[PDB]
Amino acid sequence: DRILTTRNGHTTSTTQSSVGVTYGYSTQEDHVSGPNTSGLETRVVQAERFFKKHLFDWTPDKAFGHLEKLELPTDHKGVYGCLVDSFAYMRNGWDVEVSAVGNQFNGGCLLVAMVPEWKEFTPREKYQLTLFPHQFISPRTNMTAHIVVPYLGVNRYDQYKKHKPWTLVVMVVSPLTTNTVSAGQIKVYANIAPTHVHVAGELPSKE
């Protein structure tokens, strides 16, 4: 019933504490082949798979508004990372999964959102982050958020070393509460996987 199993490549993630999958803005991808690539683009499926990253430790001291961010893509030491150094242009979506594991005795709430064209938000703007593809994480209800977003931006293809369209954001909505039965803190991890990965301008070898 409430048990979801996500699979990207030869990697899977089975979440029992899931609310569902939120698809941001659209469920389809703008044609990966446009006039800016002159039909010289290709798809690299070997890169469409999960990679992990620890975001932060959610503690009782962090109040409302505490915000942590992770601009994508980040340094990747795998196949995807190899692509970034071998090609001038790339484009891809993101299958994001964020988990804050504690126990049913913890209280509190986290907002998990994917933001296009990140900009530092002011205290007041934070009250409206729900305008972006998001999902909440509350111990009593779920320990895993799951968001899926497509590629976008002014350009059909991008140079990730100069611009990062999507930015993962996690913000404390209501501080973590603890009992004598609860967990003391909750470590928030991210399980991310790039989607519909396409490369275009093959670069020379650096030697």
Partner: protein, 178 residues
């Protein structure tokens, strides 16, 4: 979505014509920082103005333009990506002074499929290619811009004036005299 029917009420009919994006953005707005040589950049609109704030309440946008310019001497427009030196030649769209001002229709000329109000990276500031061209004249006194056929994508925060009164933001509303 919940309705008043939950407790015996009856949901009424709504006319959302005035909150239609194309309609609301379709009006003239001022641009305050002007120079004899000016590059048309919509982000130069006031951040709290009806159009300025709504524009900033979106990530990506597209629209053609219509502008009004009160100038001295002849006005010359040049498209996105043109050398600044070009503004000196009549071969480019040039409008000869006719009081009280000049009103023109300009097409979107950026090389991108759409533009952005925020850009996370390098070309802080936005890329230089995010413009509708440049205009030049001996002196430019006023500039009004109007977004025609506007399209907005990916909404972002939009804020009202913050309240201190701890209950309601009160202000003088128009009312008859005597």
């Amino acid at each position: 979505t919940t309705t008043v029917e939950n407790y015996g009420g009856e949901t009424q009919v709504q006319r959302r014509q005035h909150t239609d994006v194309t309609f609301i953005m379709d009006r003239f707005v001022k641009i305050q920082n002007l120079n004899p040589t000016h590059v048309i950049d919509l982000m130069q609109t006031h951040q709290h103005g009806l159009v300025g704030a709504l524009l900033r309440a979106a990530t990506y946008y597209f629209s053609d333009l219509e502008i009004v310019v009160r100038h001295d001497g002849n006005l010359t427009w040049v498209p996105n990506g043109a050398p600044e030196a070009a503004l000196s030649n009549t071969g480019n769209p040039t409008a000869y002074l006719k009081a009280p001002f000049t009103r023109l229709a300009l097409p979107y000329t950026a090389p991108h499929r759409v533009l952005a109000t925020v850009y996370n990276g390098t070309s802080a500031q936005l890329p230089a290619s995010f413009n509708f061209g440049a205009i030049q004249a001996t002196t430019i006194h006023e500039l009004l811009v109007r977004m025609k056929r506007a399209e907005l994508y990916c909404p972002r925060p939009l804020l009202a004036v913050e309240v201190s009164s701890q209950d309601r933001h009160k202000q003088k509303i128009i009312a008859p005299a005597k």
